[PDB]
Amino acid sequence: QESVKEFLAKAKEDFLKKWENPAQNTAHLDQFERIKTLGTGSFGRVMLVKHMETGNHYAMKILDKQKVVKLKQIEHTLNEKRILQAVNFPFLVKLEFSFKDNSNLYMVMEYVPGGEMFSHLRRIGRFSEPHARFYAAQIVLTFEYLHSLDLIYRDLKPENLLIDQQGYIQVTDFGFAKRVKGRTWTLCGTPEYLAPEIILSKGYNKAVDWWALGVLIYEMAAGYPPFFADQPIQIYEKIVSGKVRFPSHFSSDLKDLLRNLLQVDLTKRFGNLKNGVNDIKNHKWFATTDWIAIYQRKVEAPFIPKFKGPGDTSNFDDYEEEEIRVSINEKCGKEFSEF
C-alpha cells in the first residue's frame, strides 16, 4: 500500500520520460482494415479499424492536416498526441500507435465497444445519485492524476466518456488538453461546460475542469445541463448570471457539492483552494466512495453495456462514410514535423 503522494510522484517520473522523448511513427495506414465511422465533425473523424497483424480492433482518429491548419488547431493537435502518448491511468483511453502520411494524422486508440455515456444518459433519461457518483468518482481521480502532471483537460462532457465492458469510464478526446503551469487564455471547450472565466476572456487555470465536473454531475443526475438554451450566446448569459436551479429530487448533499463546484468566485470553488482535490473527495456526497476501490476497478458497476461481439457497433450511431484521401504530395510538413 502507498500514499497518493507517492503514487503521483512515481506517475510523474513515468510521464516526464515519455513527455520529453515522445513516440513517433509507430504504424502505417496499410496495417489496418477500415470497418465503420464512429464519429465525425469539422474537428476530425474516428473510425473502427482492425489491425491485420493481431486481429485486434482499434478506434483510429483521423485528422486532415489542411483542415487542422485552417481551424488554427496546429499546436492543439501536437498537444493531444504528445500528452496522450505520455499518460497512463485506468480511466484514460490508451494511445497504441500514431503516424502521419502526406495528407492526414492518425491516432490509433483502444476500442471501447460500450459507447458514449452521452447515448445511454439521453435514452435512459437520468442516472440515480449512486450511479452518477460512481462515474463522478472516476473523473475526480482522473483529474487528480492529470492535474498533478500540470495538464488541463478542457473538454469534459458525456460525449467524451466511453463505457467499457466492465461498466467503467474511459475518457477520450484530448484535442484541447494542455501542459501549462501558469494561466492560459484560449477560448475552447463546449458551451454548456464552459466556466465563467473562460467566457469572460480571463486568464484561467485547472479550476475550469472542476467547474466542468459540476456541470457533468448535474447533467448526469438531472438528465439535462444546468445552463441550457437554443443558442450558445444565451447559454453564456445563464452561466455568468450567477444563478442555478436544482431539481427537487436532488439530495441536500448533492446540491451542496454542486454549489461549491459551480462557484463563480475562484477563491471559493472546490478543487482550487488550499486543500485542493480533497475538498471534493472528503465531501459528504462522496462519504460512501472507496477511492482506492474505484481506482482498482473493484467496485461493481451500476450498468454494464451489451456485448454482442468483437467489432459490433450497435452502441454507436450511423455516420456518412467518407474516403481516406492521401495526396501524392506532402502537405503541411513543417507544421506537423514533430507528430
Partner: peptide
C-alpha cells in the same frame, strides 16, 4: 417542466466544441 423544455430544445444531441 424543465425536462420538457430541454427535450424541445435544439441542443439535445451530441455537442460540438467551440473555438475562435
Amino acid at each position: 417542466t424543465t425536462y420538457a423544455d430541454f427535450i424541445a430544445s435544439g441542443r439535445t444531441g451530441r455537442r460540438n466544441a467551440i473555438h475562435d
